[PDB]
């Protein structure tokens, strides 16, 4: 019943650069929070407690401030291992609520994605569905757009996506789509294309296939 | 010092479960637990508290409806029960405790959470489907090879190339449930084309929760 916003949802910042994170308490919570660190698939991590105090072991680089309704936690140069979560908690009052949590990451130089398209297995037709699909790797940053086309047919509500971690070496997302159809609606048609939008691009790639090619 | 928890589980909707989470280390009794959610993909957010010394339990009212939390100082474990199961509760449940902080109830010791997912869905292996592009001439130096591994269930599933022998260009993606009530995914590895079909690219998948242990050679 008190709410935890933090700004930003999203930050970037390049190897060695400072972040910073805070949060907006709805209602004045005096010195009462903590921030955590998550990572992909790990627990939570405490950093700090009680707006500003260092739980032992967590390195210098981590510092938070602020009391009543407005704190922030910094990170005086970002390091590899500080891409995760970071979430805001208030201990206050009746519910402990935390906030929706910061996503910190890896600034590196923009670059495309390389798309590839690949057609339904004759394995798969047989169970009469296909799937077309789309792989969008190594790009930065995540913000990726991918439309599919059926003979020039935007398609609307017949496909979903996925999206990897950042890599820990290149620091790039890679993306892929697919378009499910059944095997009818497939053989009717011919030409089968992805269109990608993204920065580094500087007008839309499309890959494209047709059935009988 | 370590907080374990109860194993990954799988319900109907309209089951209860209950999650326990087994201390080690220190006097449970002395200060409190907390019992976290996360939602795939979502945030963390606070479902409950209970001092096991007393019994007394404080919820967010969000779970107080559905969810009971309750502690046995007897086994220095805390357990944490929904009722009325739902697609909706599938996340991970995570106990907490905080007792090396010195000044507040932040949450220094977490356990490694406990995934419940709520499907009507049967357990059920996945059908392999090798992605290779058209033909062929093809890049270069360049291509992406894959392995479609669709309509199964429960989670997870290990995706590997070439026995492990393949690790570099490989991404296996997040899962994806489907309308099915099933789960589909998708493994692509980047290689090098003038390499290709010199090498053959096998590409090994298993389910353990249906026994099975599939096989694609991938060629376009």
């Known amino acids: 019943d008190i709410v935890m916003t933090q700004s930003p949802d999203s930050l970037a910042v390049s190897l060695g650069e400072r972040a910073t994170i805070n949060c907006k308490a709805s209602?004045?919570?005096?010195?009462?929070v903590a921030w955590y660190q998550q990572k992909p698939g790990q627990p939570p991590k405490l950093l700090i407690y009680?707006?500003?105090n260092r739980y032992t072991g967590v390195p210098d680089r981590f510092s938070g401030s602020g009391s009543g309704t407005d704190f922030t936690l910094t990170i005086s140069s970002l390091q590899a291992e500080d891409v995760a979560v970071y979430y805001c908690?208030?201990?206050?009052?009746?519910?402990?609520?935390f906030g929706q949590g910061t996503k910190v990451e890896i600034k590196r130089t923009v670059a495309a994605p390389s798309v590839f398209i690949f057609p339904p297995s004759d394995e798969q037709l047989k169970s009469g569905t296909a799937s077309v699909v789309c792989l969008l790797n190594n790009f930065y940053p995540r913000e990726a757009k991918v439309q599919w086309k059926v003979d020039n047919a935007l398609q609307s509500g017949n496909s979903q996506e996925s999206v990897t971690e950042q890599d820990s070496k290149d620091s790039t997302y890679s993306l892929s789509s697919t378009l499910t159809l059944s095997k009818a609606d497939y053989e009717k048609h011919k030409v089968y294309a992805c269109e990608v939008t993204h920065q580094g691009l500087s007008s839309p790639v499309t890959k494209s296939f047709n059935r009988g090619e | 010092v370590q907080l374990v928890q109860s194993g990954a589980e799988v319900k109907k909707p309209g089951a209860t479960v209950k999650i326990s989470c087994k201390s080690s280390?220190?006097?449970?009794?002395?200060?409190?637990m907390h019992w976290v959610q996360q939602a795939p993909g979502k945030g963390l957010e606070w479902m409950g508290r209970?001092?096991?010394?007393?019994?007394?339990?404080k919820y967010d009212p969000k779970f107080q409806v559905r969810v009971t939390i309750t502690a046995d100082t007897s086994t220095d474990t805390a357990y944490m029960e929904l009722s009325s199961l739902r697609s909706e509760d599938t996340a991970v449940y995570y106990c907490?405790?905080?007792?090396?902080?010195?000044?507040?109830?932040?949450?220094?010791?977490w356990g490694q959470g406990t995934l419940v997912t709520v499907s009507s869905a049967s357990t059920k292996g996945p059908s392999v489907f090798p992605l290779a592009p058209s033909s062929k001439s093809t890049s270069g130096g360049t291509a992406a090879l894959g392995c479609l591994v669709k309509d199964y269930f429960p989670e997870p599933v290990t995706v590997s190339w070439n026995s492990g022998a393949l690790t570099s260009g490989v991404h296996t993606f997040p899962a994806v449930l489907q309308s099915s009530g099933l789960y589909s995914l998708s493994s692509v590895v980047t290689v090098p084309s003038s390499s290709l079909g010199t090498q053959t690219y096998i590409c090994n998948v298993n389910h353990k929760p249906s026994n099975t242990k599939v096989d694609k050679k991938v060629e376009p």
């Open positions: 907490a405790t905080g007792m090396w902080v010195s000044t507040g109830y932040a949450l220094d010791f």
């Open positions: 280390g220190y006097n449970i009794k002395d200060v409190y």
């Open positions: 209970i001092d096991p010394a007393s019994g007394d339990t």
């Open positions: 209602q004045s919570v005096t010195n009462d």
């Open positions: 009680y707006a500003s």
């Open positions: 908690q208030q201990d206050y009052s009746s519910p402990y609520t």
